[PDB]
Write a protein that holds these residues in place. Structure first.
Motif, PDB file in Angstrom:
ATOM      1  N   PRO A  51       9.052  12.823   5.227  1.00 24.76           N
ATOM      2  CA  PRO A  51       9.233  11.417   4.833  1.00 24.76           C
ATOM      3  C   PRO A  51       7.989  10.615   5.196  1.00 24.76           C
ATOM      4  N   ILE A  52       7.509   9.764   4.293  1.00 29.24           N
ATOM      5  CA  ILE A  52       6.326   8.968   4.599  1.00 29.24           C
ATOM      6  C   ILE A  52       6.500   7.546   4.124  1.00 29.24           C
ATOM      7  N   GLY A  53       7.577   7.294   3.398  1.00 30.66           N
ATOM      8  CA  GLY A  53       7.822   5.953   2.904  1.00 30.66           C
ATOM      9  C   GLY A  53       9.092   5.825   2.079  1.00 30.66           C
ATOM     10  N   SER A  54       9.648   4.619   2.059  1.00 29.08           N
ATOM     11  CA  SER A  54      10.859   4.363   1.299  1.00 29.08           C
ATOM     12  C   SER A  54      10.787   2.957   0.724  1.00 29.08           C
ATOM     13  N   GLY A  55      11.739   2.654  -0.143  1.00 29.23           N
ATOM     14  CA  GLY A  55      11.768   1.352  -0.771  1.00 29.23           C
ATOM     15  C   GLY A  55      13.030   1.207  -1.596  1.00 29.23           C
ATOM     16  N   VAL A  65       0.613  17.026  -1.886  1.00 36.05           N
ATOM     17  CA  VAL A  65       1.071  16.082  -2.885  1.00 36.05           C
ATOM     18  C   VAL A  65       2.120  15.148  -2.298  1.00 36.05           C
ATOM     19  N   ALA A  66       2.385  14.058  -3.020  1.00 33.73           N
ATOM     20  CA  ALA A  66       3.421  13.104  -2.630  1.00 33.73           C
ATOM     21  C   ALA A  66       4.453  13.243  -3.725  1.00 33.73           C
ATOM     22  N   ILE A  67       5.716  13.165  -3.320  1.00 36.15           N
ATOM     23  CA  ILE A  67       6.865  13.301  -4.211  1.00 36.15           C
ATOM     24  C   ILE A  67       7.787  12.127  -4.004  1.00 36.15           C
ATOM     25  N   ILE A 103      -6.198   4.682 -11.207  1.00 34.69           N
ATOM     26  CA  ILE A 103      -4.827   4.388 -11.612  1.00 34.69           C
ATOM     27  C   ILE A 103      -4.021   5.654 -11.372  1.00 34.69           C
ATOM     28  N   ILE A 104      -2.779   5.497 -10.922  1.00 35.73           N
ATOM     29  CA  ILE A 104      -1.933   6.645 -10.660  1.00 35.73           C
ATOM     30  C   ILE A 104      -1.822   7.562 -11.871  1.00 35.73           C
ATOM     31  N   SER A 105      -1.857   8.872 -11.628  1.00 34.20           N
ATOM     32  CA  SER A 105      -1.644   9.853 -12.700  1.00 34.20           C
ATOM     33  C   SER A 105      -0.712  10.905 -12.129  1.00 34.20           C
ATOM     34  N   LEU A 106       0.291  11.290 -12.906  1.00 31.61           N
ATOM     35  CA  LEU A 106       1.253  12.272 -12.462  1.00 31.61           C
ATOM     36  C   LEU A 106       0.772  13.717 -12.583  1.00 31.61           C
ATOM     37  N   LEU A 107       1.205  14.526 -11.620  1.00 28.24           N
ATOM     38  CA  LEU A 107       0.907  15.953 -11.566  1.00 28.24           C
ATOM     39  C   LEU A 107       2.143  16.657 -12.126  1.00 28.24           C
ATOM     40  N   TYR A 158      12.316  13.097 -10.171  1.00 24.64           N
ATOM     41  CA  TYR A 158      11.296  13.322  -9.132  1.00 24.64           C
ATOM     42  C   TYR A 158       9.901  13.177  -9.718  1.00 24.64           C
ATOM     43  N   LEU A 159       9.069  12.370  -9.079  1.00 24.24           N
ATOM     44  CA  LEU A 159       7.713  12.149  -9.555  1.00 24.24           C
ATOM     45  C   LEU A 159       6.739  12.738  -8.544  1.00 24.24           C
ATOM     46  N   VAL A 160       5.687  13.382  -9.040  1.00 24.91           N
ATOM     47  CA  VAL A 160       4.719  14.017  -8.154  1.00 24.91           C
ATOM     48  C   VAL A 160       3.283  13.621  -8.448  1.00 24.91           C
ATOM     49  N   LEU A 164      -1.533  13.614  -2.975  1.00 27.42           N
ATOM     50  CA  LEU A 164      -1.274  12.961  -1.709  1.00 27.42           C
ATOM     51  C   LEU A 164      -2.460  12.134  -1.206  1.00 27.42           C
ATOM     52  N   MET A 165      -2.191  10.847  -1.042  1.00 21.42           N
ATOM     53  CA  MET A 165      -3.161   9.903  -0.551  1.00 21.42           C
ATOM     54  C   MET A 165      -2.953   9.762   0.987  1.00 21.42           C
ATOM     55  N   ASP A 166      -3.936   9.182   1.675  1.00 21.57           N
ATOM     56  CA  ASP A 166      -3.904   9.058   3.126  1.00 21.57           C
ATOM     57  C   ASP A 166      -3.354   7.798   3.729  1.00 21.57           C
ATOM     58  N   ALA A 167      -3.428   6.688   2.993  1.00 22.75           N
ATOM     59  CA  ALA A 167      -2.942   5.441   3.549  1.00 22.75           C
ATOM     60  C   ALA A 167      -2.807   4.378   2.477  1.00 22.75           C
ATOM     61  N   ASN A 168      -1.995   3.367   2.753  1.00 23.99           N
ATOM     62  CA  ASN A 168      -1.867   2.282   1.800  1.00 23.99           C
ATOM     63  C   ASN A 168      -2.845   1.167   2.207  1.00 23.99           C
ATOM     64  N   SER A 193       0.824  -3.151  -0.777  1.00 24.59           N
ATOM     65  CA  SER A 193       1.713  -2.049  -0.503  1.00 24.59           C
ATOM     66  C   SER A 193       1.722  -1.035  -1.652  1.00 24.59           C
ATOM     67  N   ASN A 194       1.309  -1.483  -2.834  1.00 25.80           N
ATOM     68  CA  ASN A 194       1.242  -0.630  -4.013  1.00 25.80           C
ATOM     69  C   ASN A 194      -0.147  -0.065  -4.294  1.00 25.80           C
ATOM     70  N   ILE A 195      -1.044  -0.116  -3.321  1.00 29.65           N
ATOM     71  CA  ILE A 195      -2.377   0.434  -3.537  1.00 29.65           C
ATOM     72  C   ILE A 195      -2.590   1.443  -2.409  1.00 29.65           C
TER      73      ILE A 195
END
Ligand SMILES: CCCn1c(C2CCN(C)CC2)nc(-c2ccc(Cl)c(Cl)c2)c1-c1ccnc(NC2CC2)n1
Length: 344
Positions: free
Chosen positions: A25-29, A46-48, A79-83, A99-101, A104-108, A149-151
């Motif tokens: 877990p690394i984030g929720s909303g 990756v982030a899922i 810009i975000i691109s899906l894997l 589920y979106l993938v 994996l980024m390091d920080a917001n 929070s979205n970057i």
């Protein structure tokens, strides 16, 4: 012999393809839960993100569908691109989660704002936000809701904007962050491409001052914070307002507004060398051009990319590269609309 497996994350369950391992877990909303993981097929992290029954109401539905569709209308490194995108459910009847993938980024950006940054990194970050925004504008997408929070960013300073912005009611335990919305969004008026430049300036100003520039419980408070620092808009700006709103802003106390040197003192900028002294001056200059209430006098995306503070990173390959949907539907209609998209 299922291609999927389930894992417990919080009071939630993640059912994913077996290639994704060691979820964390690394984030929720209010739109979903995010996890870090290792993708054994790409031998990459990756982030899922899990969208749980995104068709549950119009709010969630419109956003999920728009973003699923938009992610196909854009092709840019900022810009975000899906894997990958997938659903464990086999039929529309059974359909529940998407589920979106992505990489994996390091920080917001909120974390980045908390740190002291040299001019090289701040300008590089800003340059990327601008290249992404320019790309969206080129695709007919005006964001209008850019926020930190979205970057997301990586250690090498690379950046990605994760959502597509604005297109009602919800009972989520948490509200929305509006501190970065432009006067035109806040006062409900017409708008153009540079509505996003106001948001870039709220971010840049926060990176400097290390505090939200225009906080507030609601748009009332927020607007008070805007005029108390930048001053009351020019008379002409008002003519662009709805008679009702106009009445309200025209009848609001008239503020002189502060100068940018006062709004962003030198103390906030590293003045230990001539280089840093010149860059600080150039930064303040850009801020004063971006934090302009009247959109008619606020700098545009292309001119901001041409500003000396930003221009040192300019690259034609990155600045230029390059369906219709509107109405609303019922839960059922949305469920099918999203499922089709997910199954392509
Ligand atoms: C803290 C995690 C940041 N993050 C968010 C958040 C955005 C704002 N809401 C309110 C909460 C979640 N969404 C995605 C995200 C968005 C779209 C897709 Cl398709 C996927 Cl998979 C993930 C990622 C993220 C993405 C990549 N890396 C990271 N991690 C950096 C903070 C560690 N977070």
């Amino acid at each position: 012999d299922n291609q999927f497996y389930s894992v417990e994350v919080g009071d939630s369950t993640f059912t994913v393809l077996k290639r994704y391992q060691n979820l964390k877990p690394i984030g929720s909303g209010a739109q979903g839960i995010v996890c870090a993981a290792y993708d054994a097929v790409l031998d990459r992290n990756v982030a899922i993100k899990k969208l749980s029954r995104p068709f549950q109401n119009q709010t969630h539905a419109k956003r999920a569908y728009r973003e699923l569709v938009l992610m196909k209308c854009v092709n840019h490194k900022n810009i975000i691109s899906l894997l990958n995108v997938f659903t464990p459910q086999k039929t529309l009847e059974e359909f529940q989660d998407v589920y979106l993938v992505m990489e994996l980024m390091d920080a917001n950006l909120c974390q980045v704002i908390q740190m002291e940054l040299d001019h090289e990194r701040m300008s590089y970050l800003l340059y990327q936000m601008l290249c992404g925004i320019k790309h969206l504008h080129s695709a007919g997408i005006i964001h209008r809701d850019l926020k930190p929070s979205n970057i997301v960013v990586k250690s090498d300073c690379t950046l990605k904007i994760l959502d597509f912005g604005l297109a009602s009611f919800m009972m989520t335990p948490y509200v929305v962050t509006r501190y970065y919305r432009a006067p035109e969004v806040i006062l409900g008026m017409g708008y153009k491409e540079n509505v996003d430049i106001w948001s870039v300036g709220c971010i840049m100003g926060e990176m400097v001052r290390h505090k939200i520039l225009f906080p507030g419980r609601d748009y009332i408070d927020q607007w008070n914070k805007v005029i108390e620092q930048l001053g009351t808009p020019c008379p002409e700006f008002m003519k662009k307002l709805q008679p009702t709103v106009r009445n309200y802003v025209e009848n609001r106390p008239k503020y002189a507004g502060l100068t940018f040197p006062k709004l962003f003192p030198d103390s906030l900028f590293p003045a230990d060398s001539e280089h840093n002294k010149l860059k600080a001056s150039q930064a303040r200059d850009l801020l004063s051009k971006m934090l302009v209430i009247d959109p008619a006098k606020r700098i545009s995306v292309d001119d901001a990319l041409q500003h000396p503070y930003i221009n040192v990173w300019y690259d034609p390959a990155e600045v230029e590269a390059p369906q219709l949907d509107e109405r609303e539907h019922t839960i059922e209609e949305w469920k099918e609309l999203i499922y089709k998209e997910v199954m392509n």
